[PDB]
């Protein structure tokens, strides 16, 4: 059962996506995005990317905090909608879960599944590398190389973030 850890987390990943994609009140959509960001961090971490997983979780927690503030200011109504409160929201929510549940049920039964394209259901561990014994994290070496190999990437990203500040000041100065 533990050998299917990435699969289980990925099932919750989709459930969180169905959560905010059915579009209840953005308060609950933000909750669904936090769960997905949390388990998404768990998925990436299990492939050897501890830094990538924790970083995406950290970023999305900060982003959803702002979204929460903006929601109480600009996206609220008297009766915020939960998934059960609205017929369109419930229909999308149920449809997402049933599509998800049937993909899971059949991929587990046959150890394979055709959902448009063919996916193998042997368990995700089978593709992993078999021989590691370096004294470093390969993900950390690759990310740290941004400052030696990625000079060009550093410039365009740094410039875009500076322009981003300039732009949001322009956009919101009525």
């Amino acid at each position: 059962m533990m050998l299917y850890i990435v699969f289980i987390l990925s099932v919750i990943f989709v459930m969180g996506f169905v959560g905010f994609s059915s579009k209840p009140s953005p308060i609950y959509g933000g909750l669904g995005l936090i769960v997905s960001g949390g388990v998404g961090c768990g998925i990436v971490l299990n492939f050897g990317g501890s830094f990538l997983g924790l970083m995406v979780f950290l970023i999305y927690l900060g982003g959803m905090m702002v979204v929460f503030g903006y929601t109480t200011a600009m996206a609220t109504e008297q009766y915020p909608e939960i998934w059960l409160s609205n017929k369109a929201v419930l229909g999308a929510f149920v449809t997402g879960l049933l599509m998800e549940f049937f993909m899971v049920y059949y991929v587990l039964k046959d150890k394979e599944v055709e959902v448009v394209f063919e996916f193998n259901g042997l368990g995700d561990w089978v593709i992993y590398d078999t021989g590691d014994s370096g004294f470093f994290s390969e993900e950390a070496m690759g990310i740290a190389a941004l400052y030696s190999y990625g000079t060009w990437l550093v410039i365009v990203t740094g410039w875009s973030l500076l322009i981003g500040v300039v732009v949001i000041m322009e956009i919101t100065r009525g």
């Binding site: 990925s10 995005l33 997905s36 998925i43 690759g142 990437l153």
Partner: protein
Amino acid sequence: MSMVYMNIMMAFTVSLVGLLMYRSHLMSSLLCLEGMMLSLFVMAALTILNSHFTLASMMPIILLVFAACEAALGLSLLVMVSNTYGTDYVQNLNLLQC
């Protein structure tokens, strides 16, 4: 492909449909945009990490940076939409039919 890809591709598709099927709140659609980027981050990270493409490990980080610039840009426009109409409803943005 491996079974993890089934659910990550599914998550991207769910958010894409969520983006294309609007309701009223513009904030709800901006969330679906952020979700789409999250699935792309995870989907790209798995490929890069599993293939040991060392230098590509920075690519998902760069993806998040421009995700925030998009989210910040989206929220900026939401502020102006809200100021004009007092709601973030997308049915108010229909002046340009004529």
